[PDB]
């Protein structure tokens, strides 16, 4: 059975650097998507960026762009998504969500089979 | 009584020593968190409990 671990989040000064991470057990992350997903209280699950299998590309949404980075590792089975220069409009609850699909699309990322619990991050004052 | 007549009968309990080619069958375990053993179990039909 596919099962996703979150680990890392908190709080966070405005103006800095954080690093989650997602380990993924029951599957090897070389042949399937991994997306980030992220959501925020008062409003629906948005969408923040995935890493498809073709070619190791990567895709991130219009609001973040230079600012976050998706990277995976297939020998330790771990998926990285490294934020840089934090905002108070992200402090929200992030997931990586998967659907065993070699190929993704960034308006299918919300509804997806699998989903972790996910970690909590603030940023304030 | 005085006489007997041949009979053949199929199906008899009789064996001879012979070689030939057995065929695997492991715990099933439903091949699920195995990553990806050596032995690999999933190339031979599983066993009966």
């Known amino acids: 059975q596919v099962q996703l671990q979150e680990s890392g989040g908190g709080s966070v000064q405005p103006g800095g650097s954080l690093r989650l991470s997602c380990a993924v057990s029951g599957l090897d992350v070389e042949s399937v998507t991994i997306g980030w997903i992220r959501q925020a209280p008062g409003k629906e699950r948005e969408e923040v960026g995935c890493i498809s299998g073709n070619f190791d590309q990567t895709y991130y949404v219009d609001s973040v762009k230079g600012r976050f980075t998706i990277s995976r590792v297939n020998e330790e089975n771990t998926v990285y998504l490294q934020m840089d220069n934090l905002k108070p409009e992200d402090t929200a609850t992030y997931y990586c969500?998967?659907?065993?699909?070699?190929?993704?699309?960034?308006?299918?990322?919300?509804?997806?089979?699998?989903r972790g619990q996910g970690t909590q991050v603030t940023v304030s004052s | 009584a005085e006489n007997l007549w041949v009979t053949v009968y199929y199906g008899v309990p009789v064996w001879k020593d012979a070689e030939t080619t057995l065929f695997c069958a492991s715990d099933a375990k439903a091949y699920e968190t195995e990553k990806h053993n050596v032995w690999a179990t999933h190339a031979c039909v599983p066993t009966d409990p």
């Open positions: 969500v998967t659907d065993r699909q070699f190929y993704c699309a960034l308006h299918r990322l919300p509804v997806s089979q699998y």
